[PDB]
Design an enzyme around this catalytic site. Structure first.
Site, PDB file in Angstrom:
ATOM      1  N   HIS A  82      -5.535   8.013   9.386  1.00  0.00           N
ATOM      2  CA  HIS A  82      -4.978   7.861  10.739  1.00  0.00           C
ATOM      3  C   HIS A  82      -4.719   6.392  11.067  1.00  0.00           C
ATOM      4  O   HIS A  82      -3.618   6.038  11.496  1.00  0.00           O
ATOM      5  CB  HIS A  82      -5.930   8.479  11.777  1.00  0.00           C
ATOM      6  N   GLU A  83      -5.724   5.545  10.841  1.00  0.00           N
ATOM      7  CA  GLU A  83      -5.577   4.106  11.059  1.00  0.00           C
ATOM      8  C   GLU A  83      -4.543   3.437  10.144  1.00  0.00           C
ATOM      9  O   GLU A  83      -3.885   2.500  10.577  1.00  0.00           O
ATOM     10  CB  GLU A  83      -6.921   3.369  10.922  1.00  0.00           C
ATOM     11  N   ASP A 117       5.837  -3.381  -5.690  1.00  0.00           N
ATOM     12  CA  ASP A 117       5.296  -3.675  -7.018  1.00  0.00           C
ATOM     13  C   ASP A 117       4.161  -2.713  -7.439  1.00  0.00           C
ATOM     14  O   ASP A 117       3.344  -2.296  -6.618  1.00  0.00           O
ATOM     15  CB  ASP A 117       4.850  -5.135  -7.096  1.00  0.00           C
ATOM     16  N   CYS A 162       6.362  -5.714   0.489  1.00  0.00           N
ATOM     17  CA  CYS A 162       5.237  -6.046  -0.393  1.00  0.00           C
ATOM     18  C   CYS A 162       4.744  -4.829  -1.188  1.00  0.00           C
ATOM     19  O   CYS A 162       4.048  -4.969  -2.195  1.00  0.00           O
ATOM     20  CB  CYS A 162       4.088  -6.644   0.403  1.00  0.00           C
ATOM     21  N   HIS A 214       0.806   7.457  18.241  1.00  0.00           N
ATOM     22  CA  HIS A 214       0.174   8.749  18.488  1.00  0.00           C
ATOM     23  C   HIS A 214       1.266   9.729  18.835  1.00  0.00           C
ATOM     24  O   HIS A 214       2.262   9.352  19.448  1.00  0.00           O
ATOM     25  CB  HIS A 214      -0.884   8.680  19.596  1.00  0.00           C
ATOM     26  N   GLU A 233      -1.490  -1.469  -2.135  1.00  0.00           N
ATOM     27  CA  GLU A 233      -2.629  -2.044  -2.847  1.00  0.00           C
ATOM     28  C   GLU A 233      -3.708  -2.412  -1.858  1.00  0.00           C
ATOM     29  O   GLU A 233      -3.453  -3.176  -0.933  1.00  0.00           O
ATOM     30  CB  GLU A 233      -2.190  -3.264  -3.644  1.00  0.00           C
ATOM     31  N   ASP A 267      -2.272  -5.506  -0.393  1.00  0.00           N
ATOM     32  CA  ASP A 267      -1.382  -5.408   0.776  1.00  0.00           C
ATOM     33  C   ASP A 267      -2.102  -4.996   2.056  1.00  0.00           C
ATOM     34  O   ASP A 267      -1.516  -5.088   3.132  1.00  0.00           O
ATOM     35  CB  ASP A 267      -0.273  -4.367   0.523  1.00  0.00           C
ATOM     36  N   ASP A 273       1.344 -11.876  -4.992  1.00  0.00           N
ATOM     37  CA  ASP A 273       1.280 -10.464  -5.346  1.00  0.00           C
ATOM     38  C   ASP A 273       1.462 -10.225  -6.853  1.00  0.00           C
ATOM     39  O   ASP A 273       1.539  -9.076  -7.278  1.00  0.00           O
ATOM     40  CB  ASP A 273       2.322  -9.649  -4.546  1.00  0.00           C
TER      41      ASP A 273
END
Ligand code: MG
Ligand code: MG
Ligand code: NA
Ligand code: NA
Ligand code: NI
Ligand code: NI
Ligand code: NI
Ligand code: NI
Ligand code: NI
Ligand code: NI
Ligand code: NI
Ligand code: NI
Ligand code: NI
Ligand code: ZN
Length: 280
Positions: free
Chosen positions: A146-147, A202, A199, A156, A6, A96, A89
């Site tokens: 990527h992040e 849900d 987390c 990496h 989320e 999240d 949550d």
């Protein structure tokens, strides 16, 4: 078991000025591409990226300090975002993870080649689950994915712990048949199996609907060039490399045309290749 990430997307003043009324659809387009990547079977896991919240910073004072120092920009965003997350949550707008998008050129100590920044393995820590992304056009979707991989504890692919297992998404600087490396599949599976993605179990309540059309359907070659090289740029004047105008002067960041970009009557770009829209 199905995992749902989320997400809150945040756009800074530089993005609001640049994109104008098109901003929300642009962010959602970027995010749709990322979500499709996380759905690729090569990730060996079930992961749905969903938007539960979008914030747009029209007034700089209402956002975090954004600067060319990426690590500081990340730290600033991460502190700032905390007030915007409901504690439970069970709340529909609880997220999240949070991603900041800016037009600002981000920099390391080294160079300003950097395009994003995140912390490793932080996805279910509300105080640290954060990414910052430089918007250099639609290719920012790949930076975004990527992040978020780092946020999922993926290193990496050139790292030493990947040597026995391993071009792909986590490459130190893309194969659409297999976007994720064996190492990335391994590292996210371990992270989840060790219990750290709890987390993410849900379902979202009333998620913000992502666009289902390919990104090139919304944005033609000329628009793609504008996103990367400014509003005076246009397509230069196929599919494998997008060249833009800058004596005729043309330039490129060496990325393919977006999927769904028109390359002729009845034809569009799919994976760097011009093909018939009606498949045989
Ligand atoms: Mg709020
Ligand atoms: Mg593709
Ligand atoms: Na940069
Ligand atoms: Na740069
Ligand atoms: Ni606006
Ligand atoms: Ni839209
Ligand atoms: Ni300032
Ligand atoms: Ni490979
Ligand atoms: Ni959740
Ligand atoms: Ni203008
Ligand atoms: Ni102009
Ligand atoms: Ni053209
Ligand atoms: Ni070059
Ligand atoms: Zn990286």
């Amino acid at each position: 078991s199905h995992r749902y990430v989320e997400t809150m997307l945040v756009a800074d003043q530089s993005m609001a000025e640049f994109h104008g009324s098109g901003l929300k659809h642009y962010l959602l387009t970027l995010f749709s591409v990322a979500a499709r990547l996380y759905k690729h079977p090569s990730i060996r896991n079930s992961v749905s990226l969903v938007v539960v919240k979008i914030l747009v910073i029209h007034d700089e004072q209402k956002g975090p300090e954004v600067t060319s120092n990426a690590a500081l920009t990340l730290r600033n965003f991460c502190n700032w975002q905390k007030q915007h997350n409901p504690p439970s949550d069970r709340d529909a707008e609880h997220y999240d993870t949070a991603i900041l998008f800016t037009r600002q050129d981000l920099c390391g100590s080294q160079t300003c080649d950097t395009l994003g920044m995140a912390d490793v393995g932080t996805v279910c820590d509300p105080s640290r689950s954060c990414s910052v992304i430089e918007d250099d056009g639609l290719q920012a979707a790949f930076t975004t994915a990527h992040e978020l991989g780092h946020v999922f504890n993926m290193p990496h692919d050139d790292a030493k712990q990947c040597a026995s297992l391993n071009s792909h998404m986590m490459a130190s600087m893309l194969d659409h048949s297999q976007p994720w490396s064996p190492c990335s599949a391994y590292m996210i599976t371990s992270f989840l199996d060790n219990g750290h993605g709890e987390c993410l179990m849900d379902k979202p309540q009333n998620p913000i609907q992502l666009p289902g059309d390919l990104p090139g359907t919304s944005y033609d070659a000329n628009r793609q060039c504008q996103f990367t090289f400014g509003e005076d740029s246009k397509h230069c004047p196929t599919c494998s490399t997008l060249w833009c105008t800058g004596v005729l002067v043309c330039q490129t960041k060496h990325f393919p045309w977006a999927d769904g970009t028109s390359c002729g009557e009845g034809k569009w770009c799919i994976n760097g290749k011009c093909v018939n829209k009606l498949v045989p």
